[PDB]
């Protein structure tokens, strides 16, 4: 009888699944469509190109809405492999958006790395892996093409790309700071390199274009765009190396409903170290002998999923002096939120925590209004840092509350949220709704 | 000496003829365990390897 | 849980069953109309009767329905007549206690937030078997629900689990309980 | 048996207990003697050895599957477990015929 | 945007017809505007039948251990006591 | 140890029932040859533990109908408890500190 | 959910449906609710074998996920232990009202891994769950098990403790006797193993006033998940024969899926054959590999030459509800087409849902309307000498290892849909 | 089922006279009284009471 | 010496009987402290490989 039996055998049960069926599986519908074409071009940039250098560049006007937007950069490699790591991603250091003169979004190196250690995963994180860095062994004197897609409101949200046909008045522009040092490429650690290539760069935008009647809406009618912000503070580290667990108290000086707040710890030196650097596999340059070292990391591998190199033990969130949640260990924040909210895995000393029910969604779905708390503050407590990071007995034999004496080193914090503002667009001019 | 039983489902709208299908063992494989006296059985092609 | 004996008032036919009572005491009030009703309807016949004359039962008729009509449309609806603790002063005469009948949102009356909704002061869910609401508490819960018919003594949907709590009230009542435990004893030794 | 569990149409019927529980305890609550034996019980009725007046009982026949489940020892022989369960029924005499009613 | 919901039809009715709940409904509406028209001022010959329903079943109701006033005279019943005005008509013939 | 008086918990919904047990404690429940202080395992350092207590009530689930009633309605139980008192029988142990006439 | 509906004007004379340019996304208008994570309090000690239990405190309107975590320390060194925290997890209990609506076993945690979740998620997974790094004897770590009960899934299924006014509810955690590499290694224990330290972490939602006031005064219904449970011993043969074994299967409501597993009970997710082949024993590959002891840090494989499994087939009421299929294709061609993700050798899926990782019903079997379901098992031969690569890495696909034959137990699952209902300030189930 | 009982509670002074045997140790007489009381349930309130 | 509480759940209708399932570990393998002459204790099966 096969898929008879199981058809026939209809009970009680089943009436709340297919009495009065309101759905059919195997046929589906189509929503109304609007014909689309895609063109991706080069955008001029205004400046000099090289390392240290700031440039800016403008959207042509060369479309009806602007999709996406990739950095092409041309590196070649000092060291060999296993000494850069994500280059192209640690040398466009700040990028920021800007339309009738005003800042709408603001990117830095570190973020570009914080979204990709919590939003992005399995394939789509290796091959930005790919597009960032070397990742087949290749050797000094290399030389590739690395592309950095920008993560701005307009360039993930197919639904919110630019209207610039109803900015006709206004210019969009986008400034590329690029970093004066790129590990493996630039320097090795403090050390320059000598004959060290300065890069080259081409912006390059995704056009859309639109048939007669849906683009005249566009330009003529007023549209309101929600879209997402970055904000970003920062400080120094109270970590702890003896007899102690320090404790930081961290003004959350951000101001409107966020989605999330993420955050990192991290040694300046070095673009992607958030955990401890250690005598074994993957934890430092050398590992496993006799030149082992813990105070130069593997280049190629700076990541890890191990927490033990994590300094965070515990964090709390204050709204108003009061506790929004209670205490929880820092591995709450890089294991099961990520589990909880996004899927996937977060690497040690990222740490995440969501306001929204979906901090991957574009839909909001909850957010926390610092615009109106007067005192929101992170409270940190680190554990102390006592292991002889060289001794992998110390490092892997260890408990909780302990980490490799080399954490200290991570002295910068750096604190992110994503908030929610508005994007008012009329009469070929505009600019954010909300103040602050 | 086992009862066991059957629920006749109702996979159709009528249950008609029923017929019950039973496989049973040969039982010269099998040994009478008074010992009737000659040997009871023993395969000779299967097992015995000193045959040819 | 307080039980009242029963009675009911003039529709019907229970004008003939407890037949032969004429003037109010003790009574509920829809018992006290029922005996103006006795007394009417035999005076009105009885002088019918005695004058014939087939007028004065129309007469009678006419205000039998003109003291049903101002009982019926008359009554206040002011009445907060529930009994707690340890004082009942609204009145002392026959009435029907209150009761928070079973409704669709609340299908057991387990006052679980319908008190702080718009009663604030609720009375009672009463008893199982006071006033057929066993049968409507099943149909209410039997709302939108399927039964897979191998149940006539429906235990399938797990009618078990689901009950009345023994308060269905704002508070426990713990006066009523103390005095169920410890009787007043009225005027004692020691008095 | 180290541990005995009853599942009823794929639920289980109580947590599992020791075979201990089965062998001592359930007899001590339920009937007039402890076997001292190896011998395992259970009830679904209150008290018993019949005692002439039905105190509880499990209507198997709205069952649709039944599995016993024995965490067996180890170092038991292979052999039989032999599972009885005396059950109810109806006596039913009429005009001179007999007959068991289901 | 919004779901209301309607718990019956005068007989609860289970979310699962669709066109039964519309046709049942329309003859609802058909019986009660029928019942209205031929229960109103403007009756032809139904005087009869109302009468012939009337008596037997206006007994009958006491016949049940009780019945109430409601019931009893406004169960299509009132006009049924029309045949009192039949009566006295042929009385006042008579007398 | 009656049905009749098996606790009403269903009608105790502001009275939880609670068990308090004295459990004896480690240098007792063993009676030895030799006069120990105190015992401890081979293996490791455990100060003999209990392995596992667990506590299994019997429970009576009752039909819809008894429930409700069981709920609603008023019970009076008539149950039996205990009561006991210490005492000092010191009984004249050779020292004249007592006799053998004890009232207590 | 059951009601007839109907629109009034409002909401179809005063709008009408918008069309909507692909890029012009216009968001939901959505309910103001925030979201906090707080302890319950554990009642029962906390210690290997121990039963323990929470009743989760009316901290907040609706819940929804629910973490337990534990701290665990290890008693040996790394490739000892296998997912600790879920194998310490034994047996999650819910329970509304002491009435149960779901039941977890740590066996379906790993059996619903090895079928629901991927790449990266089932890293992170295992991470919370395992040990990842090498680390060593001594070491202590905090591991976190999140629920997967219906209402820990989504928003949409949170439990309104709101409208329970009257009945508790609760988790009931059966803590393992044994967890290997931390209380035992294989059958020896581990002496100094010190018990675990466990909370359980309970989210909730905060509603504002207008869905807060419905949730608490309306009835509500909900299409719930809920996990069947059932097992066997099987029939491994050694040689001469393929054993076939027809399992009755016990199962009452509207499934959308059916799962199973052949497991050795010895070793918590062992659902293959042991080899002396890389990934497949303790020490495999050299002298001191012992084939009768799993790479505890590596039990499964996607090898599935090591898995038991010839063929099968589900028959409903006796009927064949298919013809009859191998276990590859239980294993590998059945959650590809259904789920996408990757499942390991020795555990088999059969799905009756368009998408049994979803929520919405697309598909269900009701086997409260099956008198006679059965699963008819095919094994493979296990005559192969599993210490010889040359033969478990080269011979035919109805043969597999000798040490396959440990693999005696037979779990199988099953996940239905029923209706969990709420009224008057308590819940339960629309059905048995 | 009750079968009789000393209302215990009307007994001001109750002396137990126990005449020990001379052999004895110094030790405790522990002394038990089973007894009668009402458990009274109302209003999904417990307590025992008379 | 612990005086741990249990609370009966309200999770059935009526607290009938109630036992204590108390699992109490071998005491033959623990040492009796003061050491009082012939030793404490040595498992002699399972460990002492000097033993055949």
């Given at each position: 009888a096969g898929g008879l039996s199981q058809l026939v055998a209809y009970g009680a049960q089943d009436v709340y699944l297919t009495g009065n069926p309101q759905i059919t599986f195997f046929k589906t519908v189509y929503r109304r469509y609007t014909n689309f074409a895609i063109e991706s071009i080069q955008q001029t940039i205004n400046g000099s190109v090289g390392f240290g250098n700031k440039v800016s560049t403008q959207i042509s006007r060369n479309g009806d809405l602007i999709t996406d937007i990739v950095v092409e950069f041309v590196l070649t490699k000092g060291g060999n492999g296993g000494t850069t790591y994500y280059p192209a991603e640690e040398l466009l250091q700040d990028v920021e958006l800007e339309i009738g003169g005003q800042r709408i979004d603001k990117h830095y190196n570190d973020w570009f790395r914080t979204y990709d250690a919590l939003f992005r995963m399995n394939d789509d994180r290796y091959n930005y892996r790919r597009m960032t860095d070397w990742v087949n062994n290749e050797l000094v004197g290399a030389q590739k093409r690395f592309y950095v897609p920008l993560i701005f409101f307009f360039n993930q949200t197919p639904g919110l790309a630019l209207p610039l046909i109803a900015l006709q008045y206004h210019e969009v522009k986008l400034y590329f700071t690029l970093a004066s040092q790129v590990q493996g490429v630039n320097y090795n650690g403090s050390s320059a390199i000598a004959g060290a290539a300065q890069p080259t760069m081409s912006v390059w935008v995704d056009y859309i274009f639109l048939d007669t009647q849906e683009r005249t809406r566009f330009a003529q009618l007023p549209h309101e765009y929600l879209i997402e912000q970055l904000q970003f503070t920062g400080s120094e580290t109270a970590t702890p190396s003896a007899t102690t667990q320090a404790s930081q108290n961290i003004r959350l000086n951000f101001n409107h409903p966020t989605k999330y707040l993420a955050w990192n710890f991290n040694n300046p030196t070095n673009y992607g170290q958030y955990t401890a650097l250690a005598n074994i596999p993957g934890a430092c340059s050398g590992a496993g002998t006799a030149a082992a070292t813990v105070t130069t990391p593997d280049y190629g591998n700076t990541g890890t999923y191990n927490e033990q190199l994590a300094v965070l033990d515990s964090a709390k969130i204050q709204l108003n002096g009061q506790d929004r949640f209670a205490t929880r260990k820092g591995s709450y924040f890089n294991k099961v939120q990520p589990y909880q909210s996004i899927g996937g895995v977060t690497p040690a000393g990222v740490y995440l925590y969501s306001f929204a029910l979906k901090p991957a969604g574009r839909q909001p779905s909850g957010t926390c209004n610092f615009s109106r708390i007067d005192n929101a503050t992170l409270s940190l407590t680190y554990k102390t840092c006592s292991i002889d990071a060289t001794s992998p007995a110390a490092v892997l034999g260890n408990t909780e509350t302990v980490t490799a004496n080399t954490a200290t080193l991570l002295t910068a914090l750096n604190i992110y949220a994503k908030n929610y503002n508005v994007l008012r667009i009329m009469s070929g001019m505009g600019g954010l709704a909300y103040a602050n | 000496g086992k009862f066991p039983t059957v629920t006749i489902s109702r996979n159709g709208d009528l249950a008609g003829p029923i017929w019950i299908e039973v496989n049973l063992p040969s039982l010269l494989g099998y040994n009478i365990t008074p010992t009737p006296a000659e040997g009871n059985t023993s395969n000779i092609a299967a097992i015995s390897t000193v045959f040819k | 849980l307080y039980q009242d004996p029963v009675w009911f008032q003039d529709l019907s036919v229970i004008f003939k069953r407890p037949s032969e009572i004429i003037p109010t005491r003790d009574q509920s009030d829809s018992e006290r109309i029922n005996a103006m009703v006795r007394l009417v309807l035999y005076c009105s016949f009885a002088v019918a009767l005695i004058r014939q004359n087939y007028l004065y039962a129309i007469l009678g008729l006419a205000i039998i329905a003109i003291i049903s009509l101002a009982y019926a449309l008359g009554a206040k609806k002011t009445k907060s007549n529930e009994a707690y603790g340890n004082?009942?002063?609204?009145?002392?005469?026959?009435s029907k206690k209150s009761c928070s009948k079973s409704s669709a949102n609340n299908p057991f009356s387990n006052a679980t937030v319908g008190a702080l909704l718009d009663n604030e002061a609720r009375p009672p869910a009463c008893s199982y078997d006071d006033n057929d609401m066993a049968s409507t508490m099943r149909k209410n819960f039997n709302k939108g629900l399927f039964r897979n018919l191998d149940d006539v003594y429906e235990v399938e949907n797990s009618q078990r689990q689901f009950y009345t709590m023994p308060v269905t009230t704002a508070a426990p009542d713990l006066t009523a309980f103390g005095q169920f435990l410890y009787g007043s004893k009225g005027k004692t030794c020691k008095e | 048996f180290t541990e005995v569990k009853l599942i009823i149409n794929g639920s289980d019927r109580f947590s599992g207990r020791p075979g201990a529980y089965f062998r001592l305890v359930q007899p001590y609550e339920h009937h007039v003697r402890v076997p001292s034996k190896s011998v395992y019980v259970y009830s679904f009725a209150l008290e018993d050895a019949d005692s002439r007046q039905p105190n509880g009982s499990a209507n198997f026949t709205r069952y649709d599957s039944v599995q016993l489940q024995l965490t067996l020892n180890e170092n038991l022989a292979s052999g039989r477990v032999q599972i009885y369960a005396p059950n109810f029924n109806i006596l039913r005499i009429a005009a001179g015929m007999g007959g068991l009613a289901f | 945007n919004v779901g209301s919901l309607e718990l019956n039809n005068l007989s609860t009715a289970e979310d699962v017809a669709t066109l039964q709940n519309q046709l049942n409904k329309l003859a609802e509406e058909k019986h009660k505007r029928s019942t209205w028209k031929g229960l109103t001022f403007r009756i032809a010959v139904q005087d009869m039948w109302e009468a012939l329903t009337g008596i037997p079943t206006d007994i009958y109701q006491n016949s049940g251990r009780v019945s109430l006033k409601e019931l009893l005279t406004r169960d299509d019943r009132l006009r049924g006591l029309g045949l009192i005005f039949f009566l006295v008509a042929v009385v006042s013939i008579f007398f | 140890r009656n049905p009749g008086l098996y606790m009403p918990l269903v009608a105790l919904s502001y009275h939880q029932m609670k068990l308090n047990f004295n459990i004896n404690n480690y240098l007792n429940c063993v009676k030895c040859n030799y006069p120990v202080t105190a015992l401890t395992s081979k293996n490791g350092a455990n100060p003999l533990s209990i392995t596992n207590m667990k506590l299994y009530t019997d429970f009576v689930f009752l039909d819809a109908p008894e429930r409700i009633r069981m709920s609603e309605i008023q019970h009076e139980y008539l149950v039996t408890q205990l009561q006991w008192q210490g005492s000092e029988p010191v009984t004249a142990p050779g020292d004249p500190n007592g006799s053998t006439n004890r009232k207590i």
């Amino acid at each position: 009888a096969g898929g008879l039996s199981q058809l026939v055998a209809y009970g009680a049960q089943d009436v709340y699944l297919t009495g009065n069926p309101q759905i059919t599986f195997f046929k589906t519908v189509y929503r109304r469509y609007t014909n689309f074409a895609i063109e991706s071009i080069q955008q001029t940039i205004n400046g000099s190109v090289g390392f240290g250098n700031k440039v800016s560049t403008q959207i042509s006007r060369n479309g009806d809405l602007i999709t996406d937007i990739v950095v092409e950069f041309v590196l070649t490699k000092g060291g060999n492999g296993g000494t850069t790591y994500y280059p192209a991603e640690e040398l466009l250091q700040d990028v920021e958006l800007e339309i009738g003169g005003q800042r709408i979004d603001k990117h830095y190196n570190d973020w570009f790395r914080t979204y990709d250690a919590l939003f992005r995963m399995n394939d789509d994180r290796y091959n930005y892996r790919r597009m960032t860095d070397w990742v087949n062994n290749e050797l000094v004197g290399a030389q590739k093409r690395f592309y950095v897609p920008l993560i701005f409101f307009f360039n993930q949200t197919p639904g919110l790309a630019l209207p610039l046909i109803a900015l006709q008045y206004h210019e969009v522009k986008l400034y590329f700071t690029l970093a004066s040092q790129v590990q493996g490429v630039n320097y090795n650690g403090s050390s320059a390199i000598a004959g060290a290539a300065q890069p080259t760069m081409s912006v390059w935008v995704d056009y859309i274009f639109l048939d007669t009647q849906e683009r005249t809406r566009f330009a003529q009618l007023p549209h309101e765009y929600l879209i997402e912000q970055l904000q970003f503070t920062g400080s120094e580290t109270a970590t702890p190396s003896a007899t102690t667990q320090a404790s930081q108290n961290i003004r959350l000086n951000f101001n409107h409903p966020t989605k999330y707040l993420a955050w990192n710890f991290n040694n300046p030196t070095n673009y992607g170290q958030y955990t401890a650097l250690a005598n074994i596999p993957g934890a430092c340059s050398g590992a496993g002998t006799a030149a082992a070292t813990v105070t130069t990391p593997d280049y190629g591998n700076t990541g890890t999923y191990n927490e033990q190199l994590a300094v965070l033990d515990s964090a709390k969130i204050q709204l108003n002096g009061q506790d929004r949640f209670a205490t929880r260990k820092g591995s709450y924040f890089n294991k099961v939120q990520p589990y909880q909210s996004i899927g996937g895995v977060t690497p040690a000393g990222v740490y995440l925590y969501s306001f929204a029910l979906k901090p991957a969604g574009r839909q909001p779905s909850g957010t926390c209004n610092f615009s109106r708390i007067d005192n929101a503050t992170l409270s940190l407590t680190y554990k102390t840092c006592s292991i002889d990071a060289t001794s992998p007995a110390a490092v892997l034999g260890n408990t909780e509350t302990v980490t490799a004496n080399t954490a200290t080193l991570l002295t910068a914090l750096n604190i992110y949220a994503k908030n929610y503002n508005v994007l008012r667009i009329m009469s070929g001019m505009g600019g954010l709704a909300y103040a602050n | 000496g086992k009862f066991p039983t059957v629920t006749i489902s109702r996979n159709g709208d009528l249950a008609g003829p029923i017929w019950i299908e039973v496989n049973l063992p040969s039982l010269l494989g099998y040994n009478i365990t008074p010992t009737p006296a000659e040997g009871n059985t023993s395969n000779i092609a299967a097992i015995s390897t000193v045959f040819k | 849980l307080y039980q009242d004996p029963v009675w009911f008032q003039d529709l019907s036919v229970i004008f003939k069953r407890p037949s032969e009572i004429i003037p109010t005491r003790d009574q509920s009030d829809s018992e006290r109309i029922n005996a103006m009703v006795r007394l009417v309807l035999y005076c009105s016949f009885a002088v019918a009767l005695i004058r014939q004359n087939y007028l004065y039962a129309i007469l009678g008729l006419a205000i039998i329905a003109i003291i049903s009509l101002a009982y019926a449309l008359g009554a206040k609806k002011t009445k907060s007549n529930e009994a707690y603790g340890n004082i009942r002063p609204y009145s002392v005469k026959r009435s029907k206690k209150s009761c928070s009948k079973s409704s669709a949102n609340n299908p057991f009356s387990n006052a679980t937030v319908g008190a702080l909704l718009d009663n604030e002061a609720r009375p009672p869910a009463c008893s199982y078997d006071d006033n057929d609401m066993a049968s409507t508490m099943r149909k209410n819960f039997n709302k939108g629900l399927f039964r897979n018919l191998d149940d006539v003594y429906e235990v399938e949907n797990s009618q078990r689990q689901f009950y009345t709590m023994p308060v269905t009230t704002a508070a426990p009542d713990l006066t009523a309980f103390g005095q169920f435990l410890y009787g007043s004893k009225g005027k004692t030794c020691k008095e | 048996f180290t541990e005995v569990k009853l599942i009823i149409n794929g639920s289980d019927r109580f947590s599992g207990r020791p075979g201990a529980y089965f062998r001592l305890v359930q007899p001590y609550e339920h009937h007039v003697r402890v076997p001292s034996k190896s011998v395992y019980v259970y009830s679904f009725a209150l008290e018993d050895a019949d005692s002439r007046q039905p105190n509880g009982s499990a209507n198997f026949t709205r069952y649709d599957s039944v599995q016993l489940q024995l965490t067996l020892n180890e170092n038991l022989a292979s052999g039989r477990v032999q599972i009885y369960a005396p059950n109810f029924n109806i006596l039913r005499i009429a005009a001179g015929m007999g007959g068991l009613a289901f | 945007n919004v779901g209301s919901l309607e718990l019956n039809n005068l007989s609860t009715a289970e979310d699962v017809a669709t066109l039964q709940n519309q046709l049942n409904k329309l003859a609802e509406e058909k019986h009660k505007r029928s019942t209205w028209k031929g229960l109103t001022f403007r009756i032809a010959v139904q005087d009869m039948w109302e009468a012939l329903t009337g008596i037997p079943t206006d007994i009958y109701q006491n016949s049940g251990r009780v019945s109430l006033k409601e019931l009893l005279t406004r169960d299509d019943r009132l006009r049924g006591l029309g045949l009192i005005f039949f009566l006295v008509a042929v009385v006042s013939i008579f007398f | 140890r009656n049905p009749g008086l098996y606790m009403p918990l269903v009608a105790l919904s502001y009275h939880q029932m609670k068990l308090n047990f004295n459990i004896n404690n480690y240098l007792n429940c063993v009676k030895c040859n030799y006069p120990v202080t105190a015992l401890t395992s081979k293996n490791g350092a455990n100060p003999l533990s209990i392995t596992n207590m667990k506590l299994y009530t019997d429970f009576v689930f009752l039909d819809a109908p008894e429930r409700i009633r069981m709920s609603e309605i008023q019970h009076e139980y008539l149950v039996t408890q205990l009561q006991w008192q210490g005492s000092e029988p010191v009984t004249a142990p050779g020292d004249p500190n007592g006799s053998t006439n004890r009232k207590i």
